[PDB]
Design a protein around this ligand. Structure first.
Ligand SMILES: [Zn+2]
Ligand SMILES: [Zn+2]
Ligand SMILES: [Zn+2]
Ligand SMILES: [Zn+2]
Ligand SMILES: [Zn+2]
Ligand SMILES: [Zn+2]
Lengths: 166, 6, 168, 167
């Protein structure tokens, strides 16, 4: 039987630590955790399992707590200085050709209503709408336009704000 | 009680 | 009859008053055990001083009965409700007592005792008394003599000793 | 830069260690003969050296009230042994006229029981010394082919086993 990421036979002289998620054992050194540092913690999640958890954060059901975060994030975006061009839908008259090229329009007010209506069931759906705002802008406007730059700035801000969301 | 007298 | 009766170990003297112990069946001079003849008439079952002493010392060594257990819960509860009991209701929190477990090698508290009573862990009263005494002795060892914690242990133990009188 | 374990080596972050509660030193599981899964089942650990010291001091520490109850039992176990008949009581001068002139420090089980009763012993070594005197006196006074001599040999062997794990 093999253990750890290194897939090696058990060595009675080495320090091992067990993952509470998968129930497997790993060499403290292979997973990067001091023997003492482990004495403090009460639960352990190995690299493989942790990676799976990070990847599923966007797929799991959104909780009430998650929704408090969605409102918090959405509001920080709406208050951002570079967000003025995305607060409301594009008026058909302001740009008649807009709805001809942009197949999936989106804006912050629509997302606000969706959040209020509990329309989102997975974080991924919320991230998808936000990404749509930026992608539509970059598609419709030239790379040298302040509009295009506002999208660049806002998405960078957004990505950071999502770190450690849930 | 059981006892013994004079 | 060559037998030596009473505590004084003497031969039967027909001229003296004796009372018989229903426990050991020996016979005692009324005077040697503090019993007056006129008094004996009012006594039904009689137990001599030595048998009574053995029965008293015996109380902590005999098996605990279900009735005894009801008493143990009652005693425990009277202690948990006592004003000076607050320091002993649950296991000590390391964060509240610096190096407590480095000083006290046999911790004990009222919650742990309550659980022990619940699963009928005690088989003799002496074991219950030992755990209780442990709580007070631990406190008196860890805390200084002028500490209110130390005084709480003094008060509760005094309270406990009285509460146990006539238990069985 | 401190060295740990019986092997006296620097701490190796990748190795399994177990700490001694007595000396506070750390030991490699393998060096002290303890498996990592076996270590999860113990709350207190005493290393080989400390354990050796604890085993050696058992005869020097003060005798507790519990020790005394135990000593009385050891004596009773011996007094009941079939080969103990010659050591139950002090030798009778009328039975062996030259005994007290030959044996300078007589000893017997009844005398030891009296000593135990009055709390004469304060350390295990003192109790063991009196017992040993009983056997040494017998082996000196009687020839090696005498049943008396063999009784001493048998009873001493019994006694050594009885004392195992006393404290
Ligand atoms: Zn895992
Ligand atoms: Zn490994
Ligand atoms: Zn009696
Ligand atoms: Zn009398
Ligand atoms: Zn070693
Ligand atoms: Zn040690």
């Amino acid at each position: 039987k093999l253990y750890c990421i290194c897939k090696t036979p058990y060595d009675e002289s080495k320090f091992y630590i067990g993952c509470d998620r998968c129930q497997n054992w790993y060499h403290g050194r292979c997973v990067g955790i001091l023997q003492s540092e482990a004495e403090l913690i009460d639960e352990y999640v190995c690299p493989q399992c942790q990676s799976t958890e990070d990847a599923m954060t966007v797929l799991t059901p959104l909780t009430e707590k998650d929704y408090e975060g969605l409102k918090r994030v959405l509001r920080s975006l709406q208050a951002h200085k570079m967000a003025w061009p995305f607060l409301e839908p594009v008026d058909p008259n302001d740009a008649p050709d807009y709805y001809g090229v942009i197949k999936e329009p989106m804006d912050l007010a629509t997302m606000e209503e969706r959040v209020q209506r509990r329309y989102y069931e997975k974080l991924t759906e919320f991230v998808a709408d936000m990404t749509k705002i930026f992608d539509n802008c970059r598609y419709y406007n030239p790379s040298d336009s302040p509009f295009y730059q506002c999208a660049e700035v806002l998405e960078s801000f957004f990505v950071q704000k999502l770190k450690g969301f849930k | 009680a059981r006892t013994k007298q004079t």
